Amino acid sequence: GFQKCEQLLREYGQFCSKINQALHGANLRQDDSVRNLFASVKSSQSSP
Amino acid sequence: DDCMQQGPASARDLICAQYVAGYKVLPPLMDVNMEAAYTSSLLGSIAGVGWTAGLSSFAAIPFAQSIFYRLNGVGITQQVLSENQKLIANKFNQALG
Amino acid sequence: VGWTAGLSSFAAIPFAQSIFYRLNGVGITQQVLSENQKLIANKFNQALG
Amino acid sequence: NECVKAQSKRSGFCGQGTHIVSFVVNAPNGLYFMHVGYYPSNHIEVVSAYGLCDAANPTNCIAPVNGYFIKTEWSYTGSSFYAPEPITSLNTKYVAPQVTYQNISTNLPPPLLG
Amino acid sequence: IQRLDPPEQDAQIDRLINGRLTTLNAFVAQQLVRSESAALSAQLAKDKVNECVKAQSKRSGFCGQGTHIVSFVVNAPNGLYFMHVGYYPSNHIEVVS
Amino acid sequence: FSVDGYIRRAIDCGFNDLSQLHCSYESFDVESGVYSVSSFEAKPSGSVV
Amino acid sequence: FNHPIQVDQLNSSYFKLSIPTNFSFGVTQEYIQTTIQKVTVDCKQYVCN
Numbered sequence: 001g002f003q004k005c006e007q008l009l010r011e012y013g014q015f016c017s018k019i020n021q022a023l024h025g026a027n028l029r030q031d032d033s034v035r036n037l038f039a040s041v042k043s044s045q046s047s048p
Numbered sequence: 049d050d051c052m053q054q055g056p057a058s059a060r061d062l063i064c065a066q067y068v069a070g071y072k073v074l075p076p077l078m079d080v081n082m083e084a085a086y087t088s089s090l091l092g093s094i095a096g097v098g099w100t101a102g103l104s105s106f107a108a109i110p111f112a113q114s115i116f117y118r119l120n121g122v123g124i125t126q127q128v129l130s131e132n133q134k135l136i137a138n139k140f141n142q143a144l145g
Numbered sequence: 146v147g148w149t150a151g152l153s154s155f156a157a158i159p160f161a162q163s164i165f166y167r168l169n170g171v172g173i174t175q176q177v178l179s180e181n182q183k184l185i186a187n188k189f190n191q192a193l194g
Numbered sequence: 195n196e197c198v199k200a201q202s203k204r205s206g207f208c209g210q211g212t213h214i215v216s217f218v219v220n221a222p223n224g225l226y227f228m229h230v231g232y233y234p235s236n237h238i239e240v241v242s243a244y245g246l247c248d249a250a251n252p253t254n255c256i257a258p259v260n261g262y263f264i265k266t267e268w269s270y271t272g273s274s275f276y277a278p279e280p281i282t283s284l285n286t287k288y289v290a291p292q293v294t295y296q297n298i299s300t301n302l303p304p305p306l307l308g
Numbered sequence: 309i310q311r312l313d314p315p316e317q318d319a320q321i322d323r324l325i326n327g328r329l330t331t332l333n334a335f336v337a338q339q340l341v342r343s344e345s346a347a348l349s350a351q352l353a354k355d356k357v358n359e360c361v362k363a364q365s366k367r368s369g370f371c372g373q374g375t376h377i378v379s380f381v382v383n384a385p386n387g388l389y390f391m392h393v394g395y396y397p398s399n400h401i402e403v404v405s
Numbered sequence: 406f407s408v409d410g411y412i413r414r415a416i417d418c419g420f421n422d423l424s425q426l427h428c429s430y431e432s433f434d435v436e437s438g439v440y441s442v443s444s445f446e447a448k449p450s451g452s453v454v
Numbered sequence: 455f456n457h458p459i460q461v462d463q464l465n466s467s468y469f470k471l472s473i474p475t476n477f478s479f480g481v482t483q484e485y486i487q488t489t490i491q492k493v494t495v496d497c498k499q500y501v502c503n
């Protein structure tokens with residue numbers, strides 16, 4: 001939250017955009033991994 | 049709120065650290081009951097899925113009947129399986145118990 | 146290529162003939178495949194179209 | 195090798211449903227697989243036997259091959275598609291007798307009419 | 309900020325920035341490595357359910373040890389827990405064949 | 406540098422692209438292959454002010 | 455949760471068979487990446503211009 005720091009941070013480019021996008025993609029990857037995995041465990045027919 | 053009204057559980061509490069350090073742990077895609085539903089339906093499909101040709105039909109047969117076909121399929125003859133059905137069930141039960 | 150034993154010989158057979166062997170191999174009987182050859186080709190074509 | 199050059203018997207390896215045939219085309223950074231599978235629908239429930247034995251000759255038993263023996267007396271259907279047809283030597287195999295096999299005494303199929 | 313003026317204050321803040329940027333880059337690099345690994349692993353889990361659980365496997369060592377008979381699946385904290393029941397021979401004898 | 410310390414052989418690392426290759430691997434013998442080396446720079450032909 | 459078709463077991467020497475009466479073909483599409491774009495960098499130029 002310090003403005004002086006934020007001012008200096010800006011000189012490193014869109015650093016935080018890169019951090020957020022990299023993690024966003026990495027997190028989507030698990031939702032996709034899970035969705036695919038369960039779609040395959042799922043039975044068509046099953047007994048109670 | 050738990051981390052404010054109770055505070056950290058112990059030294060190096062990485063869950064309460066989230067609101068301090070600036071990071072967040074996100075919830076998983078499926079809740080527990082849904083994941084349980086998937087493996088529960090899977091359990092009930094085993095005897096009738098690994099039975100014959102194709103993946104399209106389901107044989108609602110007893111688990112035990114499935115085991116005997118599985119044992120026959122690996123080289124144990126039917127005369128043996130028939131004489132030993134209780135012995136086989138007991139050994140299976142010991143393995144899981 | 147996906148026709149018989151070994152990877153060494155090639156059966157130059159019609160695609161359609163291959164499909165019917167593939168369907169027979171998964172549990173659809175020959176009486177069914179014979180009665181429905183046009184129905185099967187149409188469904189296949191819908192799937193790809 | 196598994197999908198395209200062969201019909202696969204591995205559930206879920208290729209596509210969903212029962213694998214029939216796959217095709218491959220190139221894609222910008224790799225291959226694009228086109229897996230054609232067989233998707234069943236409108237399932238019905240029928241009553242099936244584990245096998246059939248000659249009631250008069252209890253050691254002479256059959257089991258279905260890649261299909262089922264269903265009530266309709268007994269007839270055969272392929273495993274992926276309900277379509278009853280007569281039980282013949284081409285859709286059966288002889289097996290050792292089992293407690294779960296039915297004892298049939300009337301309309302015995304040709305493999306048991308011995 | 310409280311102790312130093314801008315020409316030196318800047319240098320000190322900048323050290324903290326470099327260290328924290330480095331930390332975040334390392335973190336992200338590992339989340340990408342760990343998520344790639346977990347994704348490959350998830351496909352292995354997919355294959356085991358289809359090969360192991362929904363089918364009897366004939367592949368030695370793919371499922372469990374010994375000859376595979378039946379497998380079960382339950383959920384685990386970060387994945388699946390496979391329960392592979394195999395047939396284990398003992399007391400071998402030699403005969404002439 | 407020889408065992409006795411004298412320089413008997415050398416590469417001028419800016420002479421050509423092949424020389425750049427040898428220098429980047431710090432060796433007079435590099436394996437066969439296709440390698441990227443420093444680009445051929447465009448140089449100013451004048452100035453505008 | 456999308457429940458599977460429930461097929462009951464029987465208290466008998468028989469069993470219930472849930473068997474298709476109809477079918478369709480469908481296509482599962484899959485992309486597998488085999489390559490990445492190959493890139494080289496003139497590091498000396500990149501850093502110092």
Ligand SMILES: *[C@@H]1O[C@H](CO)[C@@H](O[C@@H]2O[C@H](CO)[C@@H](O[C@@H]3O[C@H](CO)[C@@H](O)[C@H](O[C@H]4O[C@H](CO)[C@@H](O)[C@H](O)[C@@H]4O)[C@@H]3O)[C@H](O)[C@H]2NC(C)=O)[C@H](O)[C@H]1NC(C)=O
Nearest residue numbers: 130131132247249252290291292293294295296297298467
């Ligand atoms: C179609 O006909 C068959 C053939 O008759 C019939 O299956 C037979 O059923 C009888 C019982 O009705 C089985 O006989 C016994 O059943 C008891 C049940 O607990 C077993 O405990 C006995 O085992 C002891 O005795 C055996 C004698 O050799 C020993 O070998 C064994 O180790 C035990 O000491 C015994 O099994 C009979 O075995 C089966 N036959 C077969 C081939 O399994 C069948 O049920 C009829 N079909 C239908 C749907 O009714």
Ligand SMILES: *[C@@H]1O[C@H](CO)[C@@H](O)[C@H](O)[C@H]1NC(C)=O
Nearest residue numbers: 110294463464465466467468
């Ligand atoms: C019906 O199920 C019960 C469950 O215990 C079993 O004891 C009984 O023998 C079964 N009857 C038949 C015909 O299998």
Ligand SMILES: *[C@@H]1O[C@H](CO)[C@@H](O)[C@H](O)[C@H]1NC(C)=O
Nearest residue numbers: 234235236474475476477478
């Ligand atoms: C199979 O499903 C299709 C879907 O529209 C339908 O048109 C066709 O008549 C169905 N066939 C049977 C035998 O029900």
